[PDB]
Every structure is written in structure tokens, then in C-alpha cells.
């Protein structure tokens, strides 16, 4: 990696090498003392637009449950690219030490999920890949849902994307917003037979067909049992939609209220980079 730099604003915590913030460094800002992941690019001409794409799109999302960015430093070795790092580990991996969420805890997952895919969605003009099997958390009492939109199994394919040539990103995702829900009240994947879920043609059958069978010591209430079967439509042109769930009776009980750098600083930097 590259040598500790403006040690005097960052504290090195750490230097990781693998997970889902790829090969990293993890640093203390000194001031606001808070956790933050830095990644590195070499200064060659591996600083391409791309890059630069990537680093302005991320930094216009402003909203709680994305990881925010943060700011742009260079150094003689590398571009520097600092953002906000979620310490409180992956969601699934909350998931399953509790084996399975209260209904009431699913929803209040499930409603940050969808307030921060809904603004990706009104911020999307290509429809990136959020990537919504590996989200985040922060970490305190309440832990916070943070979506990864960063650039540098199969339960989680909607019918169509396999299925048809031309299909909306949009629709995929709120099937994959669907399986993310099902395994927070379930403990399991949506569609993984357990007889033997390792298989493949089975689950991928499952999914075409949309057999999926919440099982007998799961109890949620019928409200909730409806958003699932609206999200689990095989035709995508009759899937619920993010705005009709935020109009659905489940996901309106106990609705919270919720519920940085200059441009050109930044591309000021990205261009030195690219020498
Ligand atoms: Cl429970």
C-alpha cells in the first residue's frame, strides 16, 4: 500500500486487504473523530475517466443509508479516495447470529433499505448495480443500513433478468429489496429447497416458477404477507413498485420521520493523478 499520509488530520487505524471494501486502508479523521475506509488508485494512467466517472457520481449521494463520500487527496504514489466506512459489519451477518429477525425489526431495515433505493433511483441515470445482497450497517444501538454504491447466489436475480433481453433495473431491484426482506423474517434464502439448496438447477427452477414457502414457525402479520407476494411477481410489469411500497400498510407502521467538496477541488485532483 502507500505510505501513511496527512498523518496529521488521520489517524492510521488499520490496513485491511480484503472484503466489501476490496484492498483498503481503514483511518480515524481526527476531527469529528469517525472511522473512515480510504482506497487507492496509482497515479499512472490508470486514472482514466472511468475513475473520474466513479467518483463524482458517488459523490452526489447524500443521503443517510448510503456509504457518503467523503473527499479526494493526493498523494506522489496514489489518488487517494476517502469514504465513510460501516464499522457494524454485513447485514446478513446480523442476520443469521440472530438467527432471524422480530417482524418489527425487518421493517425497520426494510424501511431504510427503501428510503436509500428510492433515492438511488431518482439519482440513477444509467442504474448502476447496488449490489443489495451485501448491505451494511453502521454501528450503534440502532444500527443504520448502508448501501455500498461504489465503482473502482442466484436468489437474488429476479425472473426477467435471466428471462428477457430488455428488462428495467429499477423492477429487478425491488425483487431483489424482496429477497433481502424474506431472509430477514425467514433466517434463509427465498428459493433454496432445503433438501438441497446447494444445488442450482433446482433454485434457479424455483425462482422461474416463484415457489417459495414461508415455513410453519415463521409468523408475520397478513399485511406483511401481502408486500411479499405483490414483490414475488414473476411479470415485472405487475411487481409492486418502490412508490406503492411506501404507500403499503406494513411499511407505514412506525415510519420514522426521516423517513463537502467542491467540484472543481476534486477535479483538480483527479487530473494531477492521471501524472
Ligand atoms: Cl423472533
Known amino acids: 500500500?502507500?505510505?501513511?499520509?496527512?498523518?496529521?488530520?488521520?489517524?492510521?487505524?488499520?490496513?485491511?486487504?480484503?472484503?466489501?471494501?476490496?484492498?483498503?486502508?481503514?483511518?480515524?479523521?481526527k476531527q469529528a473523530n469517525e472511522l473512515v475506509?480510504?482506497?487507492?488508485?496509482?497515479?499512472?494512467?490508470?486514472?482514466?475517466?472511468?475513475?473520474?466517472?466513479?467518483?463524482?457520481?458517488?459523490?452526489?449521494?447524500?443521503?443517510?443509508?448510503?456509504?457518503?463520500?467523503?473527499?479526494?487527496?493526493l498523494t506522489?504514489?496514489?489518488?487517494?479516495?476517502?469514504?465513510?466506512?460501516?464499522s457494524g459489519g454485513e447485514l446478513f451477518e446480523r442476520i443469521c447470529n440472530a438467527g432471524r429477525?422480530?417482524?418489527?425489526?425487518?421493517?425497520?431495515?426494510?424501511?431504510?433499505?427503501?428510503?436509500?433505493?428510492?433515492?438511488?433511483?431518482?439519482m440513477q441515470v444509467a442504474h448502476r448495480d447496488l449490489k443489495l445482497e451485501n448491505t451494511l450497517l453502521d454501528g450503534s444501538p440502532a444500527p443504520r443500513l448502508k448501501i455500498a454504491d461504489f465503482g473502482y447466489t442466484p436468489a437474488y436475480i429476479a425472473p426477467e433478468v435471466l428471462l428477457?433481453?430488455?428488462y428495467d433495473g429499477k423492477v429487478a431491484d425491488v425483487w431483489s429489496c424482496g429477497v433481502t426482506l424474506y431472509v430477514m423474517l425467514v433466517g434463509a434464502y427465498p428459493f433454496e429447497d432445503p433438501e438441497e439448496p446447494k444445488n442450482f438447477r433446482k433454485t434457479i427452477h424455483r425462482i422461474l416458477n416463484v415457489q417459495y414457502a414461508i415455513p410453519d414457525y415463521?409468523?408475520?402479520?397478513?399485511?406483511?404477507?401481502?408486500?411479499i407476494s405483490?414483490?414475488?411477481?414473476?411479470?415485472?410489469?405487475?411487481?409492486?413498485?418502490?412508490?406503492?411500497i411506501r404507500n403499503h400498510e406494513?411499511?407505514?407502521?412506525?415510519?420514522?420521520?426521516?423517513?463537502?467538496?467542491?467540484?472543481?477541488?476534486?477535479?483538480?485532483?483527479?487530473?494531477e493523478a492521471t501524472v
Open 1 to 29: 500500500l502507500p505510505i501513511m499520509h496527512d498523518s496529521d488530520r488521520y489517524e492510521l487505524v488499520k490496513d485491511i486487504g480484503a472484503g466489501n471494501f476490496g484492498v483498503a486502508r481503514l483511518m480515524r479523521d
Open 37 to 73: 475506509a480510504v482506497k487507492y488508485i496509482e497515479r499512472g494512467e490508470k486514472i482514466d475517466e472511468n475513475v473520474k466517472r466513479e467518483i463524482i457520481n458517488h459523490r452526489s449521494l447524500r443521503h443517510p443509508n448510503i456509504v457518503r463520500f467523503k473527499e479526494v487527496i
Open 76 to 86: 506522489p504514489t496514489h489518488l487517494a479516495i476517502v469514504m465513510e466506512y460501516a
Open 101 to 122: 429477525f422480530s417482524e418489527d425489526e425487518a421493517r425497520f431495515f426494510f424501511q431504510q433499505l427503501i428510503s436509500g433505493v428510492s433515492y438511488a433511483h431518482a
Open 164 to 166: 428477457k433481453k430488455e
Open 218 to 227: 415463521v409468523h408475520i402479520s397478513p399485511e406483511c404477507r401481502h408486500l
Open 230 to 244: 405483490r414483490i414475488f411477481v414473476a411479470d415485472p410489469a405487475k411487481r409492486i413498485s418502490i412508490p406503492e
Open 250 to 271: 406494513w411499511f407505514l407502521k412506525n415510519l420514522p420521520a426521516d423517513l463537502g467538496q467542491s467540484i472543481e477541488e476534486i477535479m483538480q485532483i483527479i487530473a
